Amino acid sequence: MIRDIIRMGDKRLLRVAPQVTNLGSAELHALVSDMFETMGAAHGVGLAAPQIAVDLQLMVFGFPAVPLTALANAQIEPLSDEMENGWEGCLSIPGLRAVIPRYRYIRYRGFAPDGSPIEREAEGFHARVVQHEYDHLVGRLYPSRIENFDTFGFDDVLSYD
Amino acid sequence: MIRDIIRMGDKRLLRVAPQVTNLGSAELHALVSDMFETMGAAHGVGLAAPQIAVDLQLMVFGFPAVPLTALANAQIEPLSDEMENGWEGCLSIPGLRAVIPRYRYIRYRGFAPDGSPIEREAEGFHARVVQHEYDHLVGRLYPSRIENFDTFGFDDVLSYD
Ligand SMILES: Cc1nc(-c2cccc(N)c2)cs1
Numbered sequence A, B: 001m002i003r004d005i006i007r008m009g010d011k012r013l014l015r016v017a018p019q020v021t022n023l024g025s026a027e028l029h030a031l032v033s034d035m036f037e038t039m040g041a042a043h044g045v046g047l048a049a050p051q052i053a054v055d056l057q058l059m060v061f062g063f064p065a066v067p068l069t070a071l072a073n074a075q076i077e078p079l080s081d082e083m084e085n086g087w088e089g090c091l092s093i094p095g096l097r098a099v100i101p102r103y104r105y106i107r108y109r110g111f112a113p114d115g116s117p118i119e120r121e122a123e124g125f126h127a128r129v130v131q132h133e134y135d136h137l138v139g140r141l142y143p144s145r146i147e148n149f150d151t152f153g154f155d156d157v158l159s160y161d
């Protein structure tokens, strides 16, 4: 079932989400299902549970190919100090984008919805997607990470590199 | 004549605008006319020439009542250090607003379009309008001034005080 995505300004995006405690359950599998379906309908590459007003450490993401992934209780570790700049947008902030520095290299861990452990090293766009989605679990959106406000604007208008 | 307002992302918002050198001219009077008309059609309280892609130190503003004012070659001086927070939006960033600290007290100077000198002390919302419009003359938009990103979001969604 497609869920409503809440937009920046909604307090439910600003919460720190608790862990998932229902790995392998039918209730989680359905919620994950709905999230992939919601992500797909909005043409997203990532979506976090709080963007559909569900307060849980859960995100889906994927589609350079990033693997289709559902991830509960994510925890992330930079693998280096190299930052890298890249374009980011967000379905809760429709029509806009900005350039955001993210770690180029991370490891992330947590659990697939059937409860199997997940751990991967990630780089570049894959890395950036997971960091962005992780931010939501923590009440954080990308504008608070912009350093060059010249690169922030509407998508159909922007012309920076 | 109503002009197109350009949106955040357009480089023409990021320029430092040169002075007006045509006070008392028919070309300025028409441009000022168009700006009041453009401001009115968009339900703005302020609009700066670069928001209609005209690169000049010129702004209109007004409607607590703020007097309807056209102002070329604005220069501003805080009258104190008291900052004050207030809600701001911007016609080049439609649908959004944020809380922004501005000086509570300013003096501003420059010229009415007929070339008569203008100087006023200003406080509160009047002050804030002029500071906001002044920012555009200098390539600056309000997001780069947000300190609490919790208060930044879509207007129809937001619920902070
Ligand atoms: C090239 C682009 N990437 C994105 C994007 C980047 C990181 C995270 C999410 N959720 C979206 C928007 S435009």
Ligand SMILES: Cc1nc(-c2cccc(N)c2)cs1
Pocket: B045, B046, B047, B087, B088, B089, B090, B091, B097, B128, B129, B132, B133
């Ligand atoms: C209460 C509000 N004020 C504004 C506003 C405030 C300052 C400058 C401009 N141009 C608009 C938007 S919502």
